[PDB]
């Protein structure tokens, strides 16, 4: 069975970097797009940014279209590459985890889900991944770690228009998320199987885009985390 | 396998009412509650009252846990009572079906719910009913039928203070809704299964809350219909 593993980090922290350097380094492994150029475009709205500009308003609405498609891509089948290799591997850029516990989970703590949206989100979350438990199973992350500020300068560096309005203040939020819940195990999980599961952790504070020593040196780290699986 | 039938109806045509009956006459079916008094207090705040108030605001989030929660009622395992039976039946008080082509594709038609917002609830819905094909099937439908205003004064009859508001126009598109659906079969469905599916039409434009003659009426008309099933 492939070795499934997503990607998790903060806004800017460089994924879609992340992931080419992974790309071109180990092709048998199959990486499961992340939605983000449907959400800009519906097909026609952009999702993406109302739930920006009016969180209130359109947070509750974006974590449930956000879900279904996570939650779709990890029910999909294996291709037939991953298929046919001696030690598939199967990466998602971010989970139907992180879906609840760093955004919908930050977004209620700072207001913009209310308590009928929260307990309405999280009882649907519970439920399908109680039913689809036995398809959504993951064996570790990779935690694309850096401070808040470093992905804030990232996050400037590259336009996006829906991005251009984010305040320090709010990638610290989901900094702490992802600390309280990748490094600290300080977020209440609801889940038996996510309990225990490994956690790469790569310190990219340092501008790895271009240094290919320290690329060369994410990969090794990488290989030998999910060889170890 | 026992008989699965949902009753449908317009707003107060008096399917509470009919349940009753149906509960006196056939004790050994099994008739799965429909949550309204768990949309009026969500366990805090009036979800219910909310959706009606300002609908173009919580009808989305309204429709989202109402499917939810007729999904998860459909998927629910047969009680023990309905196991040893010689003729098992399971009736629903509305369906996962009618979530969608009465009241969803209503609000949507009425303004209630964005462009965004029903192609979102319209992706769930395929999705989940697809995945859980198997498992949410129906014999049959009960319609409950009666012109909207004799609904109109029946809803008025009851005090019921969410809908104190509720204007004939809204009954009527309601009605509309149901009669395209279960009787002229004009509205376009997404489910191979639902396709022809038996429906019986009760006509109850008579208060049949009172009179002895019509009750064992209908009561007939349905233990005909179920027993041909
Ligand atoms: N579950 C979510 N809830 C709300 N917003 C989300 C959620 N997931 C992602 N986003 C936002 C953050 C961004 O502004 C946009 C990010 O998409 P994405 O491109 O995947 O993020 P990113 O910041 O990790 O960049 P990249 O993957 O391109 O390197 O959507
Ligand atoms: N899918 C839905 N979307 C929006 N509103 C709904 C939906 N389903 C039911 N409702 C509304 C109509 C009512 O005002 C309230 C009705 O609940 P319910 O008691 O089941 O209706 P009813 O009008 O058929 O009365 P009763 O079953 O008590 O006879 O919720």
Same mark, same amino acid.
């Given at each position: 069975?492939?070795?499934?593993?997503?990607?998790?980090?903060?806004?800017?922290?460089?994924?879609?970097?992340?992931?080419?350097?992974?790309?071109?380094?180990?092709?048998?492994?199959?990486?499961?797009?992340?939605?983000?150029?449907?959400?800009?475009?519906?097909?026609?709205? !952009? $999702?993406?940014?109302?739930?920006?500009?009016?969180?209130?308003? =359109?947070?509750?609405?974006?974590?449930?279209? /956000? %879900? &279904?498609?996570?939650?779709?891509?990890?029910?999909?089948?294996?291709?037939?590459?991953?298929?046919?290799?001696?030690?598939?591997?199967?990466?998602?850029?971010?989970?139907?985890?992180?879906?609840?516990?760093?955004?919908?989970? !930050? $977004?209620?703590?700072?207001?913009?889900?209310?308590?009928?949206? =929260?307990?309405?989100?999280?009882?649907?979350? /519970? %439920? &399908?991944?109680?039913?689809?438990?036995?398809?959504?199973?993951?064996?570790?992350?990779?935690?694309?770690?850096?401070?808040?500020?470093?992905?804030?300068?990232?996050?400037?560096?590259?336009?996006?228009?829906?991005?251009?309005?984010?305040?320090?203040?709010?990638?610290?939020?989901?900094?702490?998320?992802?600390?309280?819940?990748?490094?600290?195990?300080?977020?209440?999980?609801?889940?038996?199987?996510?309990?225990?599961?490994?956690?790469?952790?790569?310190?990219?504070?340092?501008?790895?885009?271009?240094?290919?020593?320290?690329?060369?040196?994410?990969?090794?780290?990488?290989?030998?985390?999910?060889?170890?699986?």
């Amino acid at each position: 069975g492939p070795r499934r593993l997503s990607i998790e980090g903060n806004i800017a922290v460089g994924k879609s970097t992340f992931v080419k350097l992974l790309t071109k380094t180990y092709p048998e492994w199959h990486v499961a797009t992340e939605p983000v150029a449907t959400w800009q475009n519906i097909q026609l709205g !952009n $999702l993406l940014d109302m739930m920006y500009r009016e969180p209130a308003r =359109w947070s509750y609405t974006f974590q449930t279209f /956000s %879900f &279904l498609s996570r939650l779709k891509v990890q029910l999909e089948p294996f291709p037939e590459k991953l298929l046919q290799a001696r030690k598939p591997v199967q990466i998602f850029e971010r989970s139907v985890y992180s879906d609840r516990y760093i955004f919908a989970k !930050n $977004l209620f703590e700072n207001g913009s889900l209310s308590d009928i949206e =929260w307990h309405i989100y999280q009882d649907w979350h /519970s %439920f &399908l991944l109680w039913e689809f438990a036995s398809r959504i199973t993951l064996h570790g992350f990779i935690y694309l770690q850096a401070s808040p500020q470093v992905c804030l300068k990232r996050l400037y560096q590259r336009a996006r228009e829906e991005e251009k309005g984010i305040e320090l203040a709010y990638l610290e939020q989901l900094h702490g998320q992802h600390e309280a819940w990748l490094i600290h195990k300080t977020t209440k999980l609801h889940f038996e199987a996510l309990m225990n599961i490994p956690v790469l952790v790569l310190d990219v504070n340092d501008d790895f885009s271009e240094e290919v020593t320290k690329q060369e040196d994410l990969m090794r780290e990488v290989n030998t985390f999910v060889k170890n699986l």
